[PDB]
Design a binder for this molecule. Structure first.
Ligand SMILES: [Fe+3]
Ligand SMILES: [Fe+3]
Ligand SMILES: [Fe+3]
Ligand SMILES: [Fe+3]
Ligand SMILES: [Fe+3]
Lengths: 587, 579
């Protein structure tokens, strides 16, 4: 592609159909064109010959067509682009995901498959390659950039040097490098991080950022490196500083509450800058089921009072530019017929969807089949014997010890406390929740590694998960060793996933046999089970928003974060670069 | 090697260092107000450069590091301007003269369709184009001349370009795509020879640019479905609007000064600048290059007529960079090429400084580095014919009406054994002069073309640049003809048995080798002079039209080196005798 549109036979026929001296293969009639170059709603009808949009012309001026799509009462849009996301977050294979989003108007995704990548390495990245080849969603894959995210602090299932990075960049399917989360590394000119960004440049493909926190000088350096986009917006002032820095913006929906901030900042700007794109980043199964993908970000922005002309412009043309794909994002002769028709510009119901000029969904439902793909190699990814009662205790030596702690959810910091020993096992200090983490990939000794958190409330039980950014080792939270094994073991033995245990009963399981991150069941099932498991864990611990909510359980072993974090190796602080092998400071 | 030149580990590491604040910049620009072409804001910032790279865009005055510190106080800072469609050749100077003229106004990239040399010397003339832009301070991104000549077998240039030639040109790293495709009716129809030329465009994975004068609706659609995506030929605001809506990239031209008011109004009217509007010169006569002139001057005029400078600037920079595929251009951000111009204000657009990759190359209005020249030898003696005589300007015997939009016509007599010309009407003479045909003066007959007391002859005639002479009587015509033939190309006015002005154009018959002063004086002075032979009665009837009467790729009937010639007949009439 776009080679596929350059075919002299189709071209020729397309011109001739455009000229009148032939019949289109499709006509879309009586819609209201959302003109994303001009911001007008304006009546017009579209003729498509094969994959090419052959004609954009006066409404009713034509009727010759091997088929006729009805659009009166409705809006005509380019299909939507999602410039950054992860199929893995929603806990379904890519096939599932494309039935859910194509159905809604999204014809192109740009997927960093770094979760599969950490779990299986190149092998996981080849899988996505395979998974999406015959799908009606175009997926441009970005090369996972930081696997693992902090070498020497943690051990996932993979490891990528520059050379592996040049390698993935040679694939035709790969479109650039994924969000570099080792920001400091890129800033102080780390040789691993630099070499990966050199390679991103030798290859003239996109180099894609994460810029959470960066201000002023630091940002300029990240850019100077070559990194050219961000999704980590924290505020309206945040969106302006990064726009004015000339970064391509990936406005993402995962935080619903910064949406109105961004809409205010854009509206006080007066126009929408052409460097704004839409993305979904990560969307749990539930959300995908009730809200949507990229369609929802359009939706909610219009609901927070962004004009639809802008939300869509950003979801389409803007997104095409960014990707150098000048076949997409816009309804015009000579471009691709990735067209979505919208009941209206409040709800964005999908009445019809095209991909490459074929009808793919009508009224919320697919009309074509989605190739499934052998999920085999994604299985068997727990490579550790069932966990025991004692795996969760810190065996130590005195009768009184001084423990290092992981004080504060999200914003982490060293703290300590005295605490009491008895039987070659620290007793958990009070006010303190264990985080036990255990190398599950077989790349490494199955040693359970236990730290003491604080700021996390009182644990009536436990919650285990092998989704844990970015190394997705087997990660357990609890306020008792026992409820910690009921919970871990329920996940090991289904092949990965999540469980809650309370008071000697497991109250909840969402198995994730593929990678320990996704599952094969339909999405209806997956959302149900994830809705349910949120309930269980709600009954284990009282959340105190924000910061001490449930999304933080997936996030605490994300070693590239400033702060101590428990990892399968010890307590990693990426500032010191060392790993606290044992939580006991002394005696 | 661009933009790989920006990608070098040794340079990147240093630029990051600078930005981080461990190493001094190679240049600071400080005290300016940055025109942020993303946000549309005017905003104070100071900028640091290492090498060719803008490394740091930061809070004013926070960094004094440096080395050389360019001053921008009381002044605005902007990325280099960029000309998404033009012709060095209509200016009548050497690429190095032109780069002198626009580099010193803040134009750091033009995109040149050199079809003009293209039709005079084929591959060789494109070949030259490239040998010459090679070391200039100006980046030129060459486009392949899509149509030499422009109605094949309707006329004759000095070359003939088929799909296999195009396709060759499109491999040259110096080439960015197919220049202005103006044989339109033959694209809309799938004529094989355009079609093969478009198709190589697409195979090439490079721009494909159009000339869409006139197409509307279906014809438009179909031009766009062959995959042509840009155009400059707009004839009103509604032509603006409609091509906008069709999804063309727009090459907003300054060369038709009289319509800028109309664009400015629709764009204001619409209410935002769309990201497909870009800006261009297209054809700038030498006196306008000097008085005005330059892509700068399209910015400057648009603003004078009421577009916001921000819009004007976004178009001239970040939009054209998107069009071009160039994320190293068009924007002042850390990570792009330090092509920057500091303008005194956003009225006069007065370049206090101009930086080109790393490097300051002009300061107030004058160049600060030498622009290397190029040998012109390939361009000599493209004049290949015998002196004419009044013979040539007469028709033997046993008819075009109207100017810029054309037509058909009638009566008169034969004295001797030659017609004696009608009345209300000037005679047109066109002679192949590139030596591929008999150099035989084909003679027609305009109307709604003043009275001519004398004649004008020119070897700059679009698009075959044959020897073209319009006049009241043989003799003057011959004396204009031989004046230009003599100089080896050029332009000249004749009256009453005398030559009143000559502009010599020894290279190709298109361009002098003299300084742009002379050439532009020689050229006002050429204007004065013709303006004493006839009464330019506008709208349309203007001097400029004397270069336009041959351009056979457009609707209506213009005379050419084989006679009088429709492209909506497909045919060419050899004499206009109907007895
Ligand atoms: Fe991120
Ligand atoms: Fe992400
Ligand atoms: Fe992740
Ligand atoms: Fe032109
Ligand atoms: Fe020309």
């Amino acid at each position: 592609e776009p080679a596929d549109l350059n075919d002299d036979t189709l071209r020729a026929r397309a011109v001739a159909a455009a000229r009148g001296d032939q019949r289109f293969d499709v006509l879309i009639t009586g819609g209201t064109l959302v003109d994303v170059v001009t911001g007008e709603l304006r009546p017009a009808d579209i003729g498509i010959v094969g994959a090419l949009i052959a004609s954009v012309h006066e409404p009713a001026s034509r009727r010759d067509a091997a088929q006729v799509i009805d659009a009166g009462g409705a809006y005509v849009s380019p299909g939507l682009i999602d410039t950054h996301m992860h199929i893995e977050s929603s806990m379904i294979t890519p096939a599932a995901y494309a039935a859910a989003v194509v159905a809604r108007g999204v014809t192109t995704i740009v997927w960093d498959p770094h979760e599969f990548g950490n779990v299986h390495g190149v092998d996981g990245v080849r899988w996505a390659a395979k998974a999406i080849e015959n799908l009606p969603l175009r997926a441009i894959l970005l090369a996972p950039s930081c696997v693992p995210s902090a070498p020497g602090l943690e051990r996932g299932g993979a490891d990528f040097d520059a050379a592996i990075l040049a390698d993935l960049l040679s694939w035709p399917e790969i479109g650039g490098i994924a969000e570099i989360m080792n920001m400091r590394g890129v800033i102080e000119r780390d040789p691993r991080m630099s070499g990966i960004v050199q390679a991103g440049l030798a290859a003239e493909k996109l180099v894609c950022g994460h810029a959470r926190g960066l201000k002023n000088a630091d940002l300029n350096a990240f850019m100077a490196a070559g990194v050219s986009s961000d999704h980590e917006l924290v505020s309206g002032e945040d969106l302006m500083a990064k726009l004015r820095a000339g970064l391509t913006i990936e406005l993402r929906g995962s935080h619903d509450h910064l949406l109105p901030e961004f809409v205010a900042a854009l509206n006080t700007l007066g126009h929408l800058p052409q460097t704004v794109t839409l993305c979904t980043d990560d969307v749990f199964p539930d959300d995908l089921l009730q809200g949507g993908g990229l369609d929802d970000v359009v939706r909610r922005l219009v609901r927070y009072g962004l004009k639809p002309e802008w939300a869509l412009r950003a979801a389409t043309l803007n997104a095409a530019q960014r990707l150098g794909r000048s076949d997409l994002g816009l309804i015009a002769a000579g471009r691709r017929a990735d067209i979505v028709v919208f009941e209206d510009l409040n709800g964005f119901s999908a009445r019809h969807v095209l991909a490459s000029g074929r009808a793919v969904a009508e009224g919320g439902r697919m009309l074509v089949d989605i190739p499934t793909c052998d999920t085999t190699v994604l299985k068997g990814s727990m490579k550790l014997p069932l966990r025991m009662a004692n795996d969760f205790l810190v065996k130590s030596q005195g009768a009184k010890v001084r423990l290092a702690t992981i004080d504060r959810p999200r914003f982490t910091q060293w703290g300590e406390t005295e605490a009491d020993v008895k039987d070659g096992f620290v007793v958990p200090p009070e006010g303190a929740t264990m985080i036990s983490v255990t190398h599950r990939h077989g790349m490494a000794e199955p040693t359970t590694k236990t730290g003491f958190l604080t700021g996390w409330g009182r644990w009536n039980g436990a919650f285990a998960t092998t989704v844990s950014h970015d190394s997705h080792n087997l990660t357990v939270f609890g306020g008792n060793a026992g409820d910690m094994a009921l919970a871990a073991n329920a996940v090991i033995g289904t092949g990965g996933g999540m469980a809650v245990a309370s008071e000697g009963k497991v109250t909840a399981i969402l198995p994730l046999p593929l990678s320990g991150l996704v599952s094969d069941a339909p999405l209806e099932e997956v959302a149900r089970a994830f809705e349910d498991l949120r309930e269980a864990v709600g009954k284990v611990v009282e959340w105190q928003p924000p910061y001490l909510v449930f999304k933080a359980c997936f996030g605490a072993t994300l070693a590239c974060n400033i702060g101590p974090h428990q990892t399968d190796m010890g307590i990693a602080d990426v500032l010191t670069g060392k790993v606290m092998e044992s939580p006991v400071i002394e005696v």
